[PDB]
Design a protein around this ligand. Sequence first.
Ligand SMILES: Cc1cc2nc3c(=O)[nH]c(=O)nc-3n(C[C@H](O)[C@H](O)[C@H](O)COP(=O)(O)OP(=O)(O)OC[C@H]3O[C@@H](n4cnc5c(N)ncnc54)[C@H](O)[C@@H]3O)c2cc1C
Ligand SMILES: Cc1cc2nc3c(=O)[nH]c(=O)nc-3n(C[C@H](O)[C@H](O)[C@H](O)COP(=O)(O)OP(=O)(O)OC[C@H]3O[C@@H](n4cnc5c(N)ncnc54)[C@H](O)[C@@H]3O)c2cc1C
Ligand SMILES: [Zn+2]
Ligand SMILES: [Zn+2]
Lengths: 229, 229
Amino acid sequence: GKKVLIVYAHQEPKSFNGSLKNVAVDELSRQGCTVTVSDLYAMNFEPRATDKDITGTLSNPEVFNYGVETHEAYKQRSLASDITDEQKKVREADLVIFQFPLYWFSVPAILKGWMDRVLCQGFAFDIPGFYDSGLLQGKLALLSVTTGGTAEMYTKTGVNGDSRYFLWPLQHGTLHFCGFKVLAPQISFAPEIASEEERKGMVAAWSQRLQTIWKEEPIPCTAHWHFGQ
Amino acid sequence: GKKVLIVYAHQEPKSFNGSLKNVAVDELSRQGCTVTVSDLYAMNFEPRATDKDITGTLSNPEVFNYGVETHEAYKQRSLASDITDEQKKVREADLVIFQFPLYWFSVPAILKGWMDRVLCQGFAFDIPGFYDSGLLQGKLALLSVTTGGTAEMYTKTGVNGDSRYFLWPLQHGTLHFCGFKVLAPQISFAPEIASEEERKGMVAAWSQRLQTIWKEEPIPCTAHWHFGQ
Ligand SMILES: Cc1cc2nc3c(=O)[nH]c(=O)nc-3n(C[C@H](O)[C@H](O)[C@H](O)COP(=O)(O)OP(=O)(O)OC[C@H]3O[C@@H](n4cnc5c(N)ncnc54)[C@H](O)[C@@H]3O)c2cc1C
Ligand SMILES: Cc1cc2nc3c(=O)[nH]c(=O)nc-3n(C[C@H](O)[C@H](O)[C@H](O)COP(=O)(O)OP(=O)(O)OC[C@H]3O[C@@H](n4cnc5c(N)ncnc54)[C@H](O)[C@@H]3O)c2cc1C
Ligand SMILES: [Zn+2]
Ligand SMILES: [Zn+2]
C-alpha cells in the first residue's frame, strides 16, 4: 500500500490547478492508495515564520532565532499544531506531490510558508544532518507546476531560461536537501492560452502519468541535471 | 537627490540582518538620501494572494483568477490599501534594497508575499512590457542576503552549487522581469558560524560598499551571468 500527500496551493477549486489536484486524487484513489490533501488556501495556512510557531516559552527569550527556536521546539514537542499536523502528514507519506501555479519563478507565498515552517530542523534535516543525511530519505517528492509562460519561453536561450533553472531552489535546495528523491517535475505550460483540447491533453497526461508513478526512478538531483551542459 | 526603499524581512531587531538594515539606513541617511524601510514582520505584512486583495466588483465572480483580478483592480484602484502603500514606496524609490536571510534557497515567505502581491500587472509589468520593457525601468534593485551555508558550500563544486544559481528566480524572474536594473548582490555568508571579527567585517564591508553604491553599474542579468553557459 502507498500513502500520498498532495500539498495544493490555489485559491479557486474550478482552476486548472484544481483539476490537476482532483485528477490526482481520483487516480491515486482508484489505485487504492491512501490520499490526503492539504488545501492551503482553504486552511488559511499561516505563511509567516514567527514566534507564534512555538508554544510555551522560548529557548532564548531575549533574541529570537527562528531556526534555533523551532529546532528546540520540535525536539521538545512544543511546535504550533498547524505545523505538527502537516509534519504528521509528511511523516506518513511515501510521496508528496506539490500542486501549484508558478509565482515569480517559484511557489506562491502560502506554499513557501509551508516549506519554511513545516520542514524544520530535527524533522526534515539536522545541522549537520542534510541532503543525503536529511531526515525524509525514502520518500518521493514531485512538483506539479503550471505556468503563464510558454514552453518556448522556458528554454536555454528563451526569455525565461530553461524551466530546470527555476526548479533548482525547490528541487535541490529544499526537497533533495531534506532527503527526498525527486521525481521528474510535471510542468503544464500556459493553460490560460491553451485551447480546450490542449488543456485536456495536459490533464489527461497527468492522469496517465499517475497510472505508473510508482514505477519511476527519481531524477539525479544534481547541479548538472539542472544547468548542464 | 536619491530615494531608497529597504524591504526588510527579519523577525529580530538584534539580528545580523537587523544590523545590516541599520547600517544601510545610517549610511544612506548620512549621504543625504531619502530612506524608507518596510519592516515586513513588524507590519504583520500579509503574504497570501487572496480575493481579499480586491475590494471592488470582480471581473469574474464565478471563477477567481488572482492575476486577472489584481490587474483589473490596479487599473480601477480597488486593490487593498496595504498593496497600494507598498507600490507608492516603490514608485518613488530610485533603489530598492531587499534585506533578508536565505530561506530554502529563496526569500522568506513574508517577502515572497510582498513580491507576489505588490508587483502586480499594470504596476510592475504589462504584457507586453516586461524584462527590459518592464514598468519599473530606470530603478535599481539589490539583494542583500545572509546565509547559513558557507561561501565554500556555495560554489560550483560545493554541496549547494554556486550562489548565483539561487539568485535566478529573484534577480531574473522577478526583478529584471519588472524592468529593474540589478546591482550585484551582497551576500553575507554564514554569520552564525563566523567569528565576531568576521561578522564585524561583513557589516563594515556592506557599509563601505554603500558609500559608493551610486557609482555602480548593474549586472548583466542573463543566464550566462548566473550559470556560465
Ligand atoms: C503573482 C503571480 C506571479 C506569477 N509569476 C509567474 C512567473 O514567474 N512565471 C510564469 O510563467 N507565470 C507566472 N504567473 C502565472 C501563473 O503561473 C499562471 O497564471 C497559472 O499557472 C495558471 O494556472 P491556473 O490554474 O490559475 O489557470 P486557470 O486560469 O485556472 O485555468 C486555465 C484554463 O484552464 C481551464 N480549466 C480548468 N480545469 C480544466 C479542465 N479540467 N480541462 C480543461 N480546462 C480546464 C480553466 O477553466 C481556464 O480556462 C504568475 C501569476 C501570479 C498571480
Ligand atoms: C526556514 C529556514 C530556511 C533556511 N534555509 C536556508 C537555506 O536554504 N540556505 C542557507 O544557506 N541557509 C538557510 N537558512 C539559514 C538562514 O539563512 C540563516 O540562519 C540566516 O541567514 C542567519 O542570519 P541572521 O540575521 O538570522 O543571523 P543572526 O543569528 O541574527 O546573527 C548571527 C550572529 O551575529 C550577531 N550580530 C548581529 N549584529 C551584529 C553586528 N553588528 N556585528 C557583529 N555581530 C552581530 C548576532 O548576535 C548573532 O550572534 C534557513 C533558515 C531558516 C530559519
Ligand atoms: Zn539535488
Ligand atoms: Zn535577468
